């Protein structure tokens, strides 16, 4: 029997996954610049590889930044500090290939303009999405996936599971049922967890620990039953992880960073980018809008699209899809959005306080669904 | 944290959902259960399994139980069936723990010949549905003298599917103006909101905590009298649609002998105690059915 | 009015990120020619005067990476320092670790174009193709390789499907030389590029044109913006439509299910629409650890199918075998034709096996 | 081309072990040799510049 049921799955990766190392390093570099120069123009790409971190991209800033220190301190905090773990901050190669921002981009975007008039730093499309299925207005699949990795990191850093290393991958498969445009998560179907580990600890001590200390502490019992499949350390000997024998890049976990397959994505990455890059600021803005609509009671689920042209301040297009979860028309919801939001980057930066150096926080465990971020605090709407 | 516990059976169904909602929010510690599709919000409980019913009631220590039946009326052929009985067990174990059981029953226990009907009036069901609802009252009342019986007419509410209410099933036939549709203009009925019935269930239960004299039969119903045909026209009027494709059949249906013509319930006893809520049908059905508008349904997909 | 806008973008061959995708798949192609069973996971990074290869390779092939990268950059059009990049003089760095010898995928199809793709991205892709073509002709000799495009289309919802009405907005940014002036570029982009790509019935007096909106675009390619493999995955796929699980395509060989099953899911989706069973469809394939066949397949036909989801699933099960091994055999995925996929989108063009609709039997 | 060549930078701080052995906490005149080593000087009267 089936009705209108389906499976959906989302992954998250821990801080030590090579791609997410790059994301966090790029955001550490951005924060370092914003501490001294709030108007810094940053486009930092990081590359992680056996024994190597390379910084490539472009930065115009008044800050004096010691790239060797910021990169190595980041790798330190992530937990790579010895050969035994496959990577050491003290002894890794750090190359830097950073130049100024193209003057052609500067003149065309932000030079000699009032803040509210600065153009989009690029063309692009960005999506925002919210769903009433969790308190945090996010898909349960991605939320559980993130929180599992966060738990592993927690239990690693407070010594309670000292055999854990920084690299990890989780996949949460939830069984869903459609409900008049909304989606009801019914049960957790499958949970996969691969995590990098000590030489000493035996396989089934880890597996016991992943179930009893990680999953039990994270996933409400209401979603777990006797049929739920657990794939804990499925391959077995995952002692080799992180950059060693692997190659990661900034912006190769954009789906993990956002909605875990749900809603939509326009393909712009977040990390290493100041507010003038609308891939970040407009995506943050669009999440804010989507969450505001659902928390404001105007719909149970929603997807928002916005687009920009480089050097132009106002969005080229804005669109709302409520999946038929609102009594009001999508056009009416658009009218409400137009009245309550100003989606130019020069304004978004004020409303969301995006010159603050708090970006490294966002580089793991997802950019959405968390308490402290301005874009997760819904706006009271007037209509 | 609230200390006032309640157990709603048939919490998965239209009525149960509304009841569990009305309680939970207003400082009750509301738990719901159901046979199928209960998880994750409610407990998986087969009322016909006495061991299951025993354990959940033993472990929960409810101060009140509201016994609803899931329901999905095609019924409204009007023949069979039920093997319950399980209202007996529920009544048994409600007493063992000392919980006030409210038994939801129907106006189909009556003849529908001399309306209105009082709580005192002699029942006379023309069908097997009416029969078992009447048996349940007997089976409950004689297994628990501290229990109550709330009789209610046809139901509607914020359904998850059109088929969950015999009022809401009509909505597609209303919407599709290009096809003519026949509907009963013979049987007299009183559509009643489960949200209203839920409020009544909370008010009645909250009285029994003060006054132990609350027991026996009670009647609630919406005040607006409507046929199946008049309801359909009221639905079109709410959503501002044409109803001329709707044709009334004043002749009784194929099994008109099994259907009570007008089983109007007299709600005077319950009106006296300050118990009662009546959402107007034109406002109630609008809030109920808007998600099932053709244009909304087209949009209700997983992905854009 | 039931009307909505939707936007998609695409980029040119000279876009830093697309440079990297093409080189990554050029490395793959070269390996597959000598060794059909080569395991490749090759990332490319690009910046002023630099191409860096990084990744894992288990292959028997001996590849001249110098020649591979340099010929790719040549083909793309970067052949002088005046253009910001030059195949003859750039730095090629190799850091590949070579040795000697699960997932959720989405496929999507819509009947709004012949190629069975969203109009927004099809046009975006074709505008870049046109620029490349007119650059190579000599018709517009001031053009340079790096370019971006973005198309916003006004749609009308029609019983599950989406009906293009008009083009709302068009963006074109293309790197150029230092002689040509701004009015000449804008006239050309409008008259020689757009009007040769977009059907006239979609263009009108209200269509907005942001052409060379930055005002100057001389500095381009890896000099103006660092490039990385796998940073254009929405451009590679459905331009904001359908759905995406996370995996990049380029630099990965066919044994990665992220690539080859995404191709297969597309194949199914297109076959359903071209077979008249749907006007629009999204196909979900869940794979699971320790099973060859998909663990579960869902089919969202947006109400555009007369047949139910279960009926469509049954049709899918007897015409398709979605076990990785069979997919690479059926679609011929061991062959070295991955470089042509690395620009202008992986879906839409008939030349690919997964874009050849299977005649369905049910 | 200076405008378009790759430039890569891999510069770190001087070793703290070297710094303490050589120049930290000393008057400039008592600075130690930065390393061991041998060095020659040479001159010849065959040209005016020696
Ligand atoms: C503008 S850049 C990204 C932001 C850049 N990293 C920065 O430092 O601001 C992204 C893409 O836009 C295009 N681009 C580069 N320079 C441009 C210009 N002056 N005008 C318009 N587009 C440009 C290129 O295709 C480039 O890869
Ligand atoms: C002193 S280093 C030259 C580094 C450079 N002069 C500087 O100070 O940045 C030259 C050699 O001396 C040796 N060396 C390095 N650290 C040293 C230390 N702390 N004490 C003595 N010798 C050292 C190593 O063999 C090294 O190759
Ligand atoms: Mg970018
Ligand atoms: Mg990029």
Residues C77 and C55 in one domain: yes
What spacing in Å lies between the alpha carbon of D14 and ligand 2's midpoint?
9
| Helix (H/G/I), strand (E/B), else coil: D32 | coil
Dihedral of the alpha carbons of A256, A259, A262, A263, in degrees to the nearest 10? -130
Q: Which residue of B has its CA nearest to C241?
A: B304
Max Cα–Cα distance, chain D, nearest Å: 47
What spacing in Å lies between the alpha carbon of A75 and ligand 2's midpoint?
26
Structure-solving method: X-ray
Helical pair B50-60 and B86-97, crossing angle rounded to 10 deg:
30
d(CA A194, CA A192): 7
What spacing in Å lies between the alpha carbon of C30 and ligand 3's midpoint?
29
Find which of C282, C283, C297, C305 to mutate to test the B interface (most B CBs within 10 Å of its CB). C282
d(CA C103, CA C296): 11
Residues C6 and C124 in one domain: yes
C214 and chain A: CB distance < 8 Å anywhere? Answer: yes
DSSP 8-class letter at A101: P
Q: Which residues contact B186 (CB under 8 A, 6 or more apart)?
A: B227, B249, B250, B251, B252, B253, B256, B261
Residues C132 and C197 in one domain: yes
Can you say how many angstroms the Cα of residue A93 is from the centroid of all Cα atoms in its chain? 27
d(CA B139, CA B71): 20
d(CA C118, CA C132): 22
Other C-beta atoms within 10 Å of A244: how many?
17
- Residue C47 structural domain: 11-101+220-256
Of residues B139, B133, B135, B134, the one with CA closest to residue B94? B139
Q: List C-alpha distances in Å: C348 to B296, C28, C307, D33.
A: 31, 22, 25, 69
Question: What CATH number matches the domain at B1-304, 3.40.50.620, 3.40.50.1220, 3.30.360.10, 3.40.50.720?
Answer: 3.40.50.720
Half-sphere exposure of B61 toward its Cβ, with a 13 Å CA cutoff? 2
d(CA A29, CA B46): 59
State yes or no: is A273 an active-site residue: yes
Q: How far apart are the first and last CA of chain B?
A: 41
Of A218, A249, A277, the one marking the end of a domain is: A277
The tokens describing A262, both together, are: 């749900």
β B5-9/B64-67 pair status = parallel
Report the atom number in ligand 1 closest to the C-alpha of C214.
20
Residues C154 and C112 in one domain: no
d(CA C60, CA C32): 10
Q: Please tell me the distance in Å from C247's CA to the nearest CA on chain A.
A: 8
d(CA C293, CA C322): 6
- DSSP codes of every residue in chain B: --S-EEEEETTTSHHHHHHHHHHHHTT-EEEEEESSS-TTTSEE--TT-HHHHHHHHHHH--SEEEE------S-----------HHHHHHHHHHHHT-EEEEEEEGGGS-SSSSSB-SSSPP--SSHHHHHHHHHHHHHHHH-TT-EEEEE-SEE-S-SSGGGSTTGGGHHHHH-TTS-EEEE-SSBB--EEHHHHHHHHHHHHHHHHH-TT--EEEE---S--B-HHHHHHHHHHHTT---TTEEEE-S--TTGGGS-SB-PBP-HHHHHTT------HHHHHHHHHGGGSHHHHHH--S--
- DSSP codes of every residue in C82-129: GGTEETTT-EEEE--EEE----EEEEEEETTSTTSS-HHHHHHHHHHH
Residues A218 and A163 in one domain: yes
Residue C325's H or E segment, with its range, is helix C324-330
The tokens describing A325, both together, are: 């979860």
d(CA C357, CA C360): 9
d(CA C115, CA C349): 7
Q: Do chains D and B touch (3 or more CB pairs under 8 A)?
A: no
Which residues of chain C neighbour A245 with C-beta distances below 8 Å?
A: 56, 97
Total domains present in chain A:
3
Could you tell me if the CB of C103 is within 6 A of ligand 1? no
Q: Whose CA is nearest to atom 1 of ligand 2?
A: D35
| Helix (H/G/I), strand (E/B), else coil: A327 | coil
| Helix (H/G/I), strand (E/B), else coil: A84 | helix
Other C-beta atoms within 10 Å of C92: how many?
18
State yes or no: is A246 an active-site residue: yes
d(CA A302, CA A298): 10
Of residues B246, B240, B150, B228, the one with CA closest to residue B191? B228
d(CA C299, CA C313): 7
Which residues of chain C neighbour D2 with C-beta distances below 8 Å?
A: none
Could you tell me if the CB of D32 is within 6 A of ligand 2? no
Residues A316 and A263 in one domain: no
Q: Is residue A157 within 8 Å of residue A198, measured between CB atoms?
A: no
B207-213, long-range: CB < 8 A, 24+ apart: B207/B273, B207/B275, B208/B64, B208/B100, B208/B148, B209/B4, B209/B63, B212/B146
Could you tell me if the CB of C144 is within 6 A of ligand 1? no
Could you tell me if the CB of C212 is within 6 A of ligand 1? no
Other C-beta atoms within 10 Å of A304: how many?
31
Task: Give chain A's length.
Answer: 383
Residues C167 and C308 in one domain: no
Which residues of chain C neighbour D5 with C-beta distances below 8 Å?
A: 48-49, 89, 91
- DSSP codes of every residue in C203-264: --TT-EEEESTTS---S-HHHHS-EETTS-TTTTTTTTSS---S---TTB-TT-HHHHHHHH
Q: Please tell me the distance in Å from D6's CA to the nearest CA on chain C.
A: 4
Q: List C-alpha distances in Å: A127 to A58, A145, A284, A292, C185.
A: 26, 21, 9, 14, 31
B137-142, long-range: CB < 8 A, 24+ apart: B137/B103, B137/B105, B137/B109, B137/B217, B139/B84, B139/B85, B139/B87, B139/B88, B139/B91, B140/B67, B140/B87, B140/B88, B140/B90, B140/B91, B140/B101, B140/B103, B141/B91, B141/B216
Residues A215 and A284 in one domain: no
Residues C281 and C349 in one domain: yes
Backbone angles phi and psi of C129, in degrees to 5? -60, -40
Residues C57 and C16 in one domain: yes
Report the atom number in ligand 1 closest to the C-alpha of A277.
4
Residues C167 and C211 in one domain: yes
Q: Whose CA is nearest to atom 26 of ligand 1?
A: C225
Q: In what order do the strands lie in the sheet with A182-197?
A: A5-13, A164-179, A182-197, A229-232
- Across-strand partners of A82? A87
Residues C139 and C110 in one domain: no
Q: Which residue of C has its CA nearest to A259?
A: C245
A178 and chain D: CB distance < 8 Å anywhere? Answer: no
State yes or no: is C256 an active-site residue: yes
Cα C241–Cα C242–Cα C246 angle in degrees, nearest 5? 105
Q: Is residue C117 within 8 Å of residue C347, measured between CB atoms?
A: yes
A63-69, long-range: CB < 8 A, 24+ apart: A63/A32, A63/A33, A63/A35, A63/A36, A63/A37, A64/A36, A65/A29, A65/A32, A65/A33, A65/A36, A67/A29, A67/A94, A67/A96, A67/A98, A68/A94, A68/D11, A68/D12, A68/D13
Domain layout of chain B by residue ranges: 1-304
Query: Where residue C321 sits, what CATH number does that domain have?
Result: 3.30.300.10
Which residues of chain A neighbour D7 with C-beta distances below 8 Å?
A: 97
The tokens describing C226, both together, are: 């660092």
Can you say how many angstroms the Cα of residue C260 is from the centroid of all Cα atoms in its chain? 14
Find which of C52, C78, C79, C81 to mutate to test the D interface (most D CBs within 10 Å of its CB). C81
d(CA B265, CA B228): 18
């Amino acid at each position: 029997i089936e009705e209108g049921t389906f499976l959906f799955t989302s992954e998250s990766v821990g801080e030590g996954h090579p791609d997410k190392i790059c994301d966090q390093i790029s955001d550490a570099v951005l924060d370092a610049h914003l501490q001294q120069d709030p108007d810094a123009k940053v486009a930092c790409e990081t590359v992680a590889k056996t024994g190597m971190i390379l910084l490539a991209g472009e930065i115009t800033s008044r800050a004096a930044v010691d790239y060797q220190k910021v990169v190595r301190e980041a790798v330190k905090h992530i937990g790579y500090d010895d050969s035994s773990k496959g990577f050491d901050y003290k002894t890794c190669n750090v190359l830097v290939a950073l130049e100024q921002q193209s003057p052609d981009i500067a003149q065309g975007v932000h030079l000699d303009r009032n803040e509210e008039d600065i153009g989009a730093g690029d063309q692009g499309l960005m999506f925002g999405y919210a769903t009433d299925e969790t308190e945090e207005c996010m898909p349960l699949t991605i939320v559980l996936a993130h929180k599992l990795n966060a738990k592993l990191a927690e239990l690693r850093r407070n010594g309670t599971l000292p055999w854990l290393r920084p690299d990890s991958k989780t996949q949460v498969t939830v069984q869903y049922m459609q409900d008049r445009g909304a989606v009801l998560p019914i049960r957790v179907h499958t949970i996969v967890i691969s995590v990098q580990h000590d030489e000493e600890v035996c396989l089934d001590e880890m597996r016991d620990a992943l179930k009893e200390k990680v999953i039990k502490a994270v996933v409400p019992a209401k979603y777990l039953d006797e049929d739920t499949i657990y794939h804990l350390q499925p391959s077995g000997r995952f002692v080799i992880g992180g950059p060693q024998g692997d190659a990661g890049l900034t912006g190769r976990k954009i789906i993990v960073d956002t909605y875990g397959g749900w809603g939509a994505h326009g393909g712009g990455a977040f990390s290493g980018k100041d507010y003038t890059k609308v891939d970040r600021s407009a995506a943050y803005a669009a999440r804010w809008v989507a969450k505001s609509l659902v928390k404001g009671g105007l719909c149970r689920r929603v997807l928002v699209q916005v687009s920009y042209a480089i050097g132009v301040s106002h969005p080229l297009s804005i669109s709302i899809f409520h999946y038929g979860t609102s009594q009001k028309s999508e056009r009416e919801l658009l009218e409400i959005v137009k009245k309550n939001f100003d989606l130019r980057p020069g304004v978004i930066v004020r409303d969301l306080d995006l010159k603050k150096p708090i970006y490294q926080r966002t580089a793991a465990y997802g950019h959405f669904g968390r308490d402290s971020f301005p874009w997760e605090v819904p706006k009271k709407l007037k209509y | 944290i609230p200390n006032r516990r309640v157990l709603v059976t048939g919490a998965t169904g239209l009525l149960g959902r509304a009841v569990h909602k009305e309680f939970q929010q207003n400082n009750w510690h509301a738990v719901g259960c159901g046979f199928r599709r209960a998880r994750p919000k409610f407990e998986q409980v087969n009322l016909l399994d006495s061991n299951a019913v025993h354990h959940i009631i033993h472990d929960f220590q409810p101060h009140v139980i509201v016994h609803c039946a899931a329901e999905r009326r095609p019924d409204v052929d009007a023949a069979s069936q039920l093997n319950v009985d399980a209202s007996g067990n529920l009544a048994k174990e409600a007493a063992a723990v000392g919980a006030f059981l409210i038994y939801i029953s129907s106006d189909y226990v009556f003849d529908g010949t001399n309306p209105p009907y009082r709580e005192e009036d002699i029942p006379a069901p023309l069908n097997l549905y009416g029969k078992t609802k009447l048996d349940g009252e007997k089976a409950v009342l004689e297994n628990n003298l501290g229990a109550a019986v709330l009789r209610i007419p046809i139901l509607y509410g914020e359904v998850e599917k059109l088929e969950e209410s015999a009022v809401t099933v009509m909505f597609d036939k209303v919407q599709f103006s290009n096809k003519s549709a026949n509907m009963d203009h013979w049987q007299q009925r009183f559509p009643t909101h489960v949200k209203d019935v839920a409020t009544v269930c909370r008010q009645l239960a909250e009285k029994r905590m003060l006054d132990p004299s609350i027991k026996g039969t009670f009647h609630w119903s919406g005040n607006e009298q409507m046929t199946k045909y008049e309801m359909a026209c009221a639905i079109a009027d709410a959503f501002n649609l044409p109803s001329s494709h709707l044709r009334p059949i004043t002749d009784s249906p194929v099994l008109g002998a099994q259907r009570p013509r007008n089983a109007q319930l007299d709600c005077s006893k319950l009106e006296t105690l300050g118990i009662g809520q009546r959402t107007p049908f034109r406002i109630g059905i609008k809030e109920s059915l808007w998600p099932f508008l053709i244009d909304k349904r087209w949009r209700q997909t997983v992905f854009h």
